[PDB]
A paper describes a structure:
Here, sirohaem undergoes decarboxylation of the southern acetic acid side-chains, attached to C12 (ring C) and C18 (ring D) of the macrocycle, to give didecarboxysirohaem in a reaction catalysed by sirohaem decarboxylase, which is composed of two subunits called AhbA and AhbB. The AhbA/B complex is a heterodimer formed from two similar protein subunits that share a near identical fold. Both proteins consist of an N-terminal and a C-terminal domain joined by a linking region. The structure of the D. desulfuricans AhbA/B complex reveals that the enzyme shares the architecture of the AsnC/Lrp family of transcription factors.
To investigate this idea attempts were made at producing crystals with bound substrate, where native crystals were grown in an anaerobic chamber and soaked with sirohaem. The soaked crystals diffracted to 1.9 Å and contained additional density consistent with the presence of a tetrapyrrole. The electron density of the bound tetrapyrrole suggests the decarboxylations at C12 and C18 had occurred and the bound molecule is actually the product didecarboxysirohaem. The observation also indicates that the crystals are functional as a decarboxylase. Overall, little movement is observed upon substrate/product binding as there is only a r.m.s.d. of 0.3 Å between native and product bound complexes for the 296 equivalent Cα atoms. His115 (AhbA) coordinates the iron in the macrocycle (2.8 Å) and Arg119 (AhbA) is positioned such that it could interact with the propionate group from ring D of sirohaem (2.8 Å). Lys152 (AhbB) is in a position to interact with the acetate group from ring A although the electron density for this side-chain is poor suggesting it is in disordered state in this product complex. These side-chains help to position didecarboxysirohaem with the methyl group of ring C (C12) within range of Arg102 (AhbB). We suggest this is the catalytic residue responsible for decarboxylation of this side-chain. Mutation of Arg102B to an alanine residue formed an inactive AhbA/B complex.
Residue numbers in the entry:
A (entry chain A): 22 to 166
B (entry chain B): 1 to 159
The structure:
Amino acid sequence: DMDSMDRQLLDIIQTGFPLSPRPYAELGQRLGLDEQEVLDRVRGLKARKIIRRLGANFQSAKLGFVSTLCAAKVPQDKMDAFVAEVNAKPGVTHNYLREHDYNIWFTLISPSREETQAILDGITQATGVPILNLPATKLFKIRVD
Amino acid sequence: MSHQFSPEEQAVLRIVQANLPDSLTPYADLAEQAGMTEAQVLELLGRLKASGAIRRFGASIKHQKTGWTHNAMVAWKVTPDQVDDCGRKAAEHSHISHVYYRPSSAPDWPYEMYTMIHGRSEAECLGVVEDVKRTTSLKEHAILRSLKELKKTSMTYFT
């Protein structure tokens, strides 16, 4: 789908796109390419969508944010209003209908355990539906590709 | 954010959380857009990279099959003495990315260990569930089959 130079480039820039004033030149120096060809190549890979984004990816916890998984038993008659209150929240990034009495499961991220609970309490006050706040206290091993 | 980052630094982070400017000189572009010098832009990103706050500064790519196909969230009962062993023995399975322990004292939700299972078929994902029962002490569980994806969004940390 691309040449070995592009695979070398990606291998470098998935670990780390360089922090220097002329990053393409640093990459060009390392790859045996002129600066403009490395930009041309990055721009082509982005436009073929093999590069989805070029930028920062943050570790939530280190920015002071906490995350949780929430669950509710949502009667058919409250489903629409519940789902809208949940999806309205910018810190809800996943929301799923699932096959169980606890049929609505969503993640919620915020700056603090207290802010998260106030969000959940507001949802329940708007919909009459109680919510279980289920934060993880232990993680056993996590991978991505 | 204002307890950890100046306004100018947040301006940088708002831009980079989406995309680096598209020139030969993206850090000079960041500096002119935000309040600051190119060297200050580089110190800020450099500091957060070093600290781990920035997990990756670079390219996010497609393909590489982000889990062949088909996911499975299953919740298991587990006693405190079993947690670490089961969590560990469960996480050893090739088709299980991560296992969380999320304590619960809801009487009607007694499941606390969550194994995120990957597969191809239904009966593969469920085959992994039988694998967990023979290789750990986990037994009782609830398969929380996804019926409908209601929201799927990335978090915006800098607003």
